[PDB]
Paper text:
Egg-white [name], similarly to streptavidin from the bacterium Streptomyces avidinii, is a small, tetrameric protein which belongs to the calycin superfamily. The interaction between [name] and biotin, its natural ligand, is one of the strongest non-covalent interactions known in biology (dissociation constant of ~10−15 M) and has been extensively characterized for more than three decades. The structural motif of this protein consists of an eight-stranded antiparallel β-barrel surrounded by flexible loops. In the present work, we have determined the first crystal structures of the [name] complexes with two fluorescent pyrene-biotin conjugates: 1-biotinylpyrene (B9P) and 1-desthiobiotinylpyrene (D9P), which were obtained via a Friedel–Crafts acylation of pyrene with biotin or desthiobiotin, respectively.
Initial co-crystallization trials in search for diffraction quality crystals of [name] in complex with B9P failed to yield single crystals. Thus, the streak seeding method was used to obtain single crystals of the [name]/B9P complex. The crystals belong to the orthorhombic space group P212121, with the unit-cell parameters a = 57.16, b = 81.95, and c = 107.89 for [name]/B9P and a = 58.97, b = 81.52, and c = 107.78 for [name]/D9P. The final models of the [name]/B9P and [name]/D9P complexes were refined to resolutions of 2.0 Å and 2.1 Å, respectively. The B9P molecule consists of the ureido ring, tetrahydrothiophene ring, valeric acid, and the pyrene moiety, while D9P molecule includes the methyl group and methylene bridge instead of the tetrahydrothiophene ring. The binding cavity in each subunit of [name] is occupied by a single ligand molecule with the same orientation, with the ring system of biotin and desthiobiotin moieties hidden deeply inside the β-barrel, while the pyrene moiety is located at the barrel entrance. The sulfur atom from the tetrahydrothiophene ring of B9P acts as an acceptor for the hydroxyl group of Thr77, while in the case of D9P there is no equivalent interaction. The fluorescence maximum was shifted to 425 nm upon the binding of B9P to [name]. The hypsochromic shift of the fluorescence maximum upon [name]/B9P complex creation may indicate that the [name] binding loops in the area of pyrene are less polar than the bulk solvent. Interestingly, we found that the crystal of [name]/B9P complex exhibited pink fluorescence upon excitation by a strong synchrotron X-ray beam during diffraction data collection.
Residue numbers in the entry:
A (entry chain B), C (entry chain C): 2 to 123
B (entry chain A): 3 to 123
D (entry chain D): 2 to 124
Write the structure that this text describes.
Amino acid sequence: RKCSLTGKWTNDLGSNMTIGAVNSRGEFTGTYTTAVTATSNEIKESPLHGTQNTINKRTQPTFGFTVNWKFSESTTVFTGQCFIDRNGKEVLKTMWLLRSSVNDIGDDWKATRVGINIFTRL
Amino acid sequence: KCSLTGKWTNDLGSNMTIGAVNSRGEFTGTYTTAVTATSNEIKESPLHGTQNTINKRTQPTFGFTVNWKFSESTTVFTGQCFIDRNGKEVLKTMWLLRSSVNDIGDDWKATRVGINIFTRL
Amino acid sequence: RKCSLTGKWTNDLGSNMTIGAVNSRGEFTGTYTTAVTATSNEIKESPLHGTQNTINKRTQPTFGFTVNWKFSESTTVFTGQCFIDRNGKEVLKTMWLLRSSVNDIGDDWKATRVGINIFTRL
Amino acid sequence: RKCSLTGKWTNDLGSNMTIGAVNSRGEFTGTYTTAVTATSNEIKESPLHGTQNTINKRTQPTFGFTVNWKFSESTTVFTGQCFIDRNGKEVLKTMWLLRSSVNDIGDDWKATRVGINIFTRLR
Ligand SMILES: O=C1N[C@H]2[C@H](CS[C@H]2CCCCC(=O)c2ccc3ccc4cccc5ccc2c3c45)N1
Ligand SMILES: O=C1N[C@H]2[C@H](CS[C@H]2CCCCC(=O)c2ccc3ccc4cccc5ccc2c3c45)N1
Ligand SMILES: O=C1N[C@H]2[C@H](CS[C@H]2CCCCC(=O)c2ccc3ccc4cccc5ccc2c3c45)N1
Ligand SMILES: O=C1N[C@H]2[C@H](CS[C@H]2CCCCC(=O)c2ccc3ccc4cccc5ccc2c3c45)N1
Ligand SMILES: *[C@@H]1O[C@H](CO)[C@@H](O)[C@H](O)[C@H]1NC(C)=O
Ligand SMILES: *[C@@H]1O[C@H](CO)[C@@H](O)[C@H](O)[C@H]1NC(C)=O
Ligand SMILES: *[C@@H]1O[C@H](CO)[C@@H](O)[C@H](O)[C@H]1NC(C)=O
Ligand SMILES: *[C@@H]1O[C@H](CO)[C@@H](O)[C@H](O)[C@H]1NC(C)=O
């Protein structure tokens, strides 16, 4: 069918996320449980909010979301595309930017990390 | 505090308006790009995001998604709101622009990266 | 047993590269055969030039290199780190930037793609 | 007529680099003096090695180089294009990846930072 974002996912790093119903404007909300973190602070489940692109109602749509971490001053944004193979196996191929907080504008240059994640269903 | 609400323009000439930021840090708005990857006519597009409220920083991090209404593509922006040495607010952001590809074997080439600096308009 | 860049490698996309000897300053040269390309033009083997970081002569050093494509106006740069496991299996975890040419500076914004690659020995 | 990498440059952060002659294969070397650093160590001038793309011998070519930092375990790679306006004013629009060292492969995910730089000539 269409590749749908709703439901439960895990990534190559062991992180989980659950996304709820996608409304008619493509808006969704959920939660994200990272399996990894940059430092010793305790991981807390964090909210995410995003949109799926609905133009031409593609069966493999692009999308993006923001994770607003509840245990860091940082923000991660993820963007990717939902693929589906002939057996109906779904996968999200994503890239992210992780923005840290810096105290001063002179340190902005070092504030942004980059990486990928591949998510498959639970 | 450096506040996301209001009207902004970037180094490329794009405009965006962000509304009120609620108690969970959620905001919505609209984005008018000045530039585009292809010939399709530009349309104003919704954005949705969140500002980080931990320690209620006067210069908080944030992120938002632009759900383009004239492309199959998605752009995500993340940055931090600074209050500059001239007293001006400025958003320093980096973005990932995801294009749609028909086949998973082409995924590798789908994601572009860049920056934008926004100032108030 | 240090993780050494010299020799023949293949990545998750099927691309091959062969790196020669790494000199005492960490400098190396080689060739890169991509398995994929952005367009229809025929792929040609292309030169690469790089450096491995030698500070503290780490057994898992960072490195970078430039691929000077011989069939495109484009350039790709890769940067990563060479890892080992105790049975001696080496792997390079890398991220790349692929710079396309544009014929007007007003189009610079779109010129740069980003991704990852994982290489293992042949 | 062509935008040439050789010579002395400075970027929006204040960093300087000097690039030497670009040979017929497009190979160059030089030195990089960052104005900024992620941590307290004293900044040391560092070698760079790169190539400019010569396909179709464009007057505004792409290029890339690696900076092998002499004061960190880290590596930076820069890639971009040399632009030249009608008065002959040159500028390098670049983007970079900064790879830090991590002790364990389980930390790889956090190792890579991203950003941009714009360089203009020093006469
Ligand atoms: O599934 C996935 N998980 C990872 C990737 C992309 S998002 C990433 C999780 C990041 C959570 C924040 C974090 O680890 C964290 C934790 C504690 C920090 C303490 C102090 C910090 C100071 C500056 C910057 C930080 C950035 C992230 C930090 C922390 C800091 N995919
Ligand atoms: O303010 C800022 N503006 C720029 C930067 C980052 S977001 C970027 C604007 C992106 C608009 C979407 C687009 O270009 C677009 C439009 C139409 C497309 C039609 C067909 C496409 C086919 C493949 C790939 C595409 C990629 C982007 C496309 C389009 C396509 N900052
Ligand atoms: O092993 C790996 N392979 C891939 C990844 C990162 S490097 C990439 C291979 C790049 C080959 C050059 C290319 O695709 C290429 C070739 C011809 C082009 C002609 C015209 C272009 C116009 C705009 C943008 C381009 C981008 C890449 C192009 C070409 C163009 N890892
Ligand atoms: O002109 C430009 N300059 C900046 C940008 C991109 S390259 C960047 C300079 C990087 C110098 C290395 C560095 O800061 C550095 C120095 C010491 C470090 C010690 C320990 C580290 C541990 C983890 C990560 C690091 C990242 C950079 C580090 C260092 C570490 N443009
Ligand atoms: C992901 O979900 C599984 C069970 O449904 C659980 O074992 C695992 O702990 C979860 N991951 C994280 C990082 O919480
Ligand atoms: C941004 O706003 C200014 C002032 O209203 C306007 O003149 C300009 O055309 C707008 N730009 C775009 C891309 O809509
Ligand atoms: C890489 O090497 C393998 C084994 O030698 C070979 O079969 C394959 O064709 C090579 N790939 C490319 C892209 O040349
Ligand atoms: C670069 O050179 C300029 C003048 O040539 C100098 O004023 C500046 O301090 C130098 N910057 C660095 C980082 O060395």
